[PDB]
């Protein structure tokens, strides 16, 4: 299934994901597409920050749901 | 601005709303688009049930935020 | 048999339940495991809120089905 | 990557860890370095006690984050 | 006598307690002042987690000693 | 005593601070060294954002602790 | 006089500047308002990247001209 | 010989490379070490972006030279 | 999308244009808004004079880019 | 007297000129200093392109006035 | 901040410099460290020879950038 | 004989030159092949800038030697 990530730049990127994929995987898929390191990504769906731990279905992210990307920059 | 209301069943409606619109209004806009009576709608954002009283901005629902729709159905 | 109750926030509890258990019982078993009063629980399956009245099998909740937990008010 | 674990007593251990390492692993790495049994360790990040279950990235522990060590010992 | 409980979040609460009060009592007094359920509280003094069983004087917590509050969530 | 602040660039500033100094003071000492206005600084220790109100010892920042400097950048 | 900077986030910030102010100054004024380190800022006007060296009038930036902010992230 | 690549986070990876290795190879060696897809990597030495085509010696990258890893993020 | 055309005299017109519009069209849209004959207009972007032939996207003129207007005035 | 010729790109040349010098002369003095052929130069003052014909004082270009240099085609 | 100046001969100097230092200053700092007269130094960054006039930040020389040293000597 | 000119930008041009050709000639041959005006070229061999005056053999530039091209802009 397909989901959408809208970034801080306003850009709307599409990802092929599986409900059993983790937030970590999605972060990783985003790096693979836009270059941002996963440690610097924060994903938001329905008014929560998502945990790298959990999966898309853990949060009820279904076919064509839209996620938000925020950036955290730290000297890591 | 646009928001998304997704049911747990995976159906997703898009709504044209104003930050100053109330939960009541959104419920009403949902009925106007999918037929569900507002008394049978429960809206959820950021893990909590929204009150018909308050407004979208009261809850920090912004451009392209996603809400969750849960339904009350008698004998359903 | 086992079922799963997931919150929208992504937390997931497992419960040991019987098909003949009621929604009331499941609510009660959830309180027994996570502390939430049953009056504050809303259970959701197949897109709709379940009635305390009915049973799991009344709704077709089988071995390893997933329910949703939403919270009322305080 | 490196992280720091500081006790409330002011002692500080440095650990070589991976974001995918679990709290269990970190506990285990601490024993390997200072002798404390993992069942006697409580790790704290961002104000709260971490679960042995979850991983460092589950909590957003990144390169050079600082964790807190508290000790649990019966009658100690 | 007065003691201080400092959370890892930087907040500092003051409590009116008696040397003969138990850790359980202090937990209970903290709930009464900040809302946190005692099952979610961990008190720390002199580097170690205190037992609900024991009392303040059992640990040598005197007038104006500082305890640490950590949170444990299920 | 000395503490370290890491910026978003990965650069490390060293600060001479006193445990009784406030977050406000440290922010102010950082501006004095790297130019960033205190209102724009987000200091993070052990996974939480520090409040200008509190002091270093309020947070358990000791000799040679490392603080992080964070920027959060959010969508349109 | 007033100028506008539109950022990568889509945000449009207003700056009080003098024609004799340098690009460095503007960068510095932006940090003072949004937190971004000047070394990470790239300013664009009329299809050129601006040099920290030159001034607003060097480029013909007048009252109410609009500049663009791009971000360059590097391990500096 | 050894070279150093610094990321946007400020983190430093070390690479065992040969002067006759191409930028493509180095990009590939970086993916193998930090996960970033080569198409998303922008390597900078001495102020210019390196082309996948050319080799390290084509650019005068010698024993212990430092390369930079850049991300450019642009407005809507 | 919107673009800005600024004269050297500091006057700034805003235009509603399409990336596929030609320089000729923009000139024509400028006449329609400020009266200047297209033969008396010289458009400049990124330091070079634009050709009536080419289009906005041919030159990479995007949403909110700024063009420069220079004028030809006989005996003026 | 001195005048300044600035490109839109922010580069700025200084020229020693006389009020009675023509636009042609200034173009010619610019070539002599930066290499650009006069046929490729467009000089701009007070928002308009100057004519090779006229002089600096014809346009009111005085000590330390600033002109603009734009480039034609190649 | 630190920068590196490498000669084509493979010799490498490190310099402590400030972004506001001029090319003249850097030349002067090089003489102070290796003896070469500034009139005999040519500094190169991003493929081009730097002007004594401009500053490091004018060119976007940041923390740990690498410059190139060429030598100009009559009949040498 | 052939020589190589490598720019700092990583590009590598090949030139057909004669040992008796001057630095001026090589500059001129580079313009003829890549467009750069000779006044903007700096040639570097063995660590130092070459003089337009001298010849390739004056510097010991032989078959397949490599020169370096840097750019100087006014
Ligand atoms: Mg994980
Ligand atoms: Mg992670
Ligand atoms: Mg430390
Ligand atoms: Mg400067
Ligand atoms: Mg080096
Ligand atoms: Mg700068």
CA distance L6 to L67: 6
Which residues lie closer than 8 Å to K11 by C-beta, 6 or more apart? Answer: none
The neighbourhood of ligand 1, an ion, using CB within 5 A, equals A 24, 52; D 55, 57
Q: In this structure, what token pair is assigned to residue E33?
A: 């002042």
CA J69 – CA J59 distance, rounded (Å)? 16
CA angle E56, E61, E64 (to 5 degrees): 125
Touching L: which chains, 3+ CB pairs < 8 A?
H, K
Q: Which of A40, A49, G70 is nearest to H36 (CA)?
A: A40
CB neighbours of J4 closer than 8 A, spacing ≥ 6?
Answer: J12, J13, J14, J15, J64, J65, J66, J67
CA distance B55 to C15: 37
SS3 B21: coil
Q: What angle do CA F12, F14, F18 make, to 5 degrees?
A: 145
CA D31 from chain center: how many Å? 10
Ligand nearest to the backbone CA of G38: 6
Flag if H6 and F11 touch (Cβ within 8 Å).
no
CB contact (8 A) between residue F62 and residue D4: no
Spatial distance between the Cα atoms of I45 and L6, rounded to a whole number of angstroms: 32
- CA nearest H50: which of A34, A35, K47? K47
* φ/ψ of residue K69, rounded to 5: -105, 125
d(C-alpha E27, C-alpha E49), whole Å: 13
Q: Which residues contact C20 (CB under 8 A, 6 or more apart)?
A: C55, C56, C57
Structure tokens at E52: 């609900």
Q: L7: which 2 tokens?
A: 């720019």
3-state secondary structure of L58: helix
Task: State whether residue F66 is helix, strand or coil.
Answer: strand
- Measuring CA to CA, which residue among K52, K53, K49 is closest to residue K67? K49
> Residue B59, by phi and psi: left (phi above 0), alpha (psi -120 to 50) or beta?
alpha
Please list all protein residues whose beta carbon sits less than 5 angstroms from ligand 2, which is an ion: A 52; D 19, 57
Provide Rg for chain K, Cα atoms: 11
End-to-end, the C-alpha distance of chain E in Å comes to 33
Does the CA dihedral A28-A32-A34-A39 come out positive or negative?
A: positive
Strand partners, F48: F45
Residues 6+ apart with CB under 8 A from F35: G28, G31
d(CA F13, CA F8): 12
Helical spans, DSSP H, in F14-67: 23-34, 56-59
Sheet containing F12-16: order of strands: F12-16, F2-6, F66-69, F43-45, F48-49
Q: Which of F7, F38, F32 has its CA nearest to residue F17?
A: F32
E-state strands within I1-76: 2-7, 12-16, 41-45, 48-49, 66-71
The answer to whether the CB atoms of D45 and F46 lie below 8 A apart is yes
Chains in touch with K (≥3 Cβ pairs < 8 A): G, H, L
Please enumerate in sequence order all residues whose Cβ is within 8 A of that of E18, keeping only pairs 6 or more positions apart, or say none.
E1, E56
Cβ A73 vs Cβ F8: under 8 Å: yes
Contact K8, L68 (CB under 8 A): yes
DSSP assignment of J6-20: EETTS-EEEEE--TT
Kindly state the tokens that stand for E36.
């946190």
| CA–CA gap between residue J70 and residue D23 (Å, rounded) | 65
The token pair that represents H27 in the structure block: 């990009």
User: Which residue spans within C1-74 are E strands per DSSP?
Assistant: 2-7, 12-16, 41-45, 48-49, 66-71
Among G22, G73, G72, which residue's Cα sits nearest to residue G50? G22
Could you tell me the sign of the dihedral formed by the alpha carbons of L59, L64, L66, L71, in that order?
positive
Q: SS3 string of D23-74? A: HHHHHHHHHHHHCCCHHHEEEEECCEECCCCCEHHHHCCCCCCEEEEEECCC
Beta bridge partners of J43: J69
Sheet holding H2-6, edge to edge: H12-16, H2-6, H66-69, H43-45, H48-49
DSSP, collapsed to helix, strand or coil, labels residue D2 as strand
The closest of F57, F53, F51 to F20, measured between CA atoms, is F57
Taking each continuous run of H as one helix and of E as one strand, the counts in chain F are 2, 6
> Cβ H48–L6 below 8 Å, yes or no?
no
d(CA J5, CA G34): 35
CA distances from D29 to D33, F2, G4 (A): 6, 28, 53
Residues of H with Cβ-Cβ distance to D1 under 8 angstroms: 11
Tell me the two tokens of residue F52.
């200008």
**Residue that is written with structure tokens 């000639």 in the block:** L25
Phi, psi of K23 (to 5 degrees): -55, -45
How far is residue C28's CA from residue L60's CA, in Å, rounded to a whole number?
94
Dihedral sign, Cα of residue K42, residue K46, residue K47, residue K49:
negative
Q: Which residues contact J44 (CB under 8 A, 6 or more apart)?
A: I8, I70, J50, J67, J68, J69, J70
What resolution in angstroms does the PDB record give? 3.1
Alpha-carbon span C41 to C70, nearest angstrom: 6
The response to whether F58 counts as a known ligand-binding position is no
- Answer whether D72's CB lies under 8 Å from D12's CB: no
Q: Which two tokens stand for residue I69?
A: 């207007």
Unique residue bearing structure tokens 């290499």: J35
Do strands J2-7 and J66-71 pair parallel, antiparallel, or not at all (unpaired)? Answer: parallel
As annotated, the binding site of G includes 24, 39, 52
Torsion of CA B30, B36, B40, B43, to 10 degrees: -30
Lookup result for tokens 């500033």: F13
Backbone angles phi, psi at A42, to 5 degrees: -125, 120
Q: Locate J34 and state its tokens.
A: 């930066």
The Cα–Cα gap between E36 and E27 comes to 9
Alpha-carbon span H25 to H50, nearest angstrom: 12
Strand A66-73 to F71-74 pairing:
antiparallel
CB–CB of A11/A45 below 8 Å? Answer: no
The secondary element (H helix, E strand) that includes residue E68 is strand E66-71
Which residues of chain F lie closer than 8 angstroms to H11, CB-CB?
Answer: 10
Q: Which of C25, I29, E8, H48 is nearest to F57 (CA)?
A: E8
Q: How far apart are CA K51 and CA K54, in angstroms?
A: 6
**H or E segment to which residue C59 belongs:** helix C56-59
* Stretch (H or E) spanning L33: helix L23-34
Q: Do chains H and J touch (3 or more CB pairs under 8 A)?
A: no
Which residues does G contribute to its contact with F (CB < 8 Å)?
9-11, 28, 31-37, 39-40, 74-76
G22: closest chain K residue by CA:
K58
Rg over alpha carbons for chain I, rounded to the nearest Å, is: 11
The phi, psi pair for F69, rounded to 5°, reads -110, 120
| Residue found by looking up tokens 């009056």 in the block | C39
Angle, alpha carbons C55-C60-C64 (nearest 5°): 100
- How far is CA A75 from its chain centroid? 22
Contact between F23 and F55 under an 8 Å Cβ cutoff? The reply is: yes
Q: Do the beta carbons of residue H41 and residue H13 sit within 8 Å?
A: no
Cα L51 from Cα C60, distance rounded (Å) = 91
Identify the residue whose tokens are 């329905």: A46
Question: Do E9 and E71 form a contact (C-beta atoms < 8 A)?
Answer: no
Q: Which residues pair with G12 in a beta bridge?
A: G6
Name the experiment that determined this structure: X-ray
Q: Which residues, listed in sequence order, are joined to residue J45 by a DSSP beta bridge?
A: J48
Other C-beta atoms closer than 10 Å to the C-beta of A20 total 10
Say which ligand is closest to the CA of A39.
Answer: 2
CA-closest candidate to residue I22, choices I65, I64, I62, I51: I51
The residue among E42, E40, E35 whose CA lies nearest residue D8 is E42
Question: Cβ neighbours of residue H75 under 8 Å, at least 6 residues apart?
Answer: A9, A10, G6, G7, G8, G10, G68, G69, G70
Tell me, yes or no, whether chains F and G touch by having 3 or more C-beta pairs under 8 A: yes
Please identify every residue whose CB atom is under 5 Å from ligand 6, which is an ion: G 52; K 19, 57
Scanning the structure block, which residue is given the tokens 């972006």? H49
């Amino acid at each position: 299934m397909q989901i959408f990530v809208k970034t801080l730049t306003g850009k709307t990127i599409t990802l092929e994901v599986e409900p059993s994929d983790t937030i970590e995987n999605v972060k990783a898929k985003i790096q693979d597409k836009e270059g941002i390191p996963p440690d610097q990504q924060r994903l938001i769906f329905a008014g929560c920050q998502l945990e790298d731990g959990r999966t898309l279905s853990d949060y009820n992210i279904q076919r064509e749901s839209t996620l938000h990307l925020v950036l955290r920059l730290r000297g890591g």
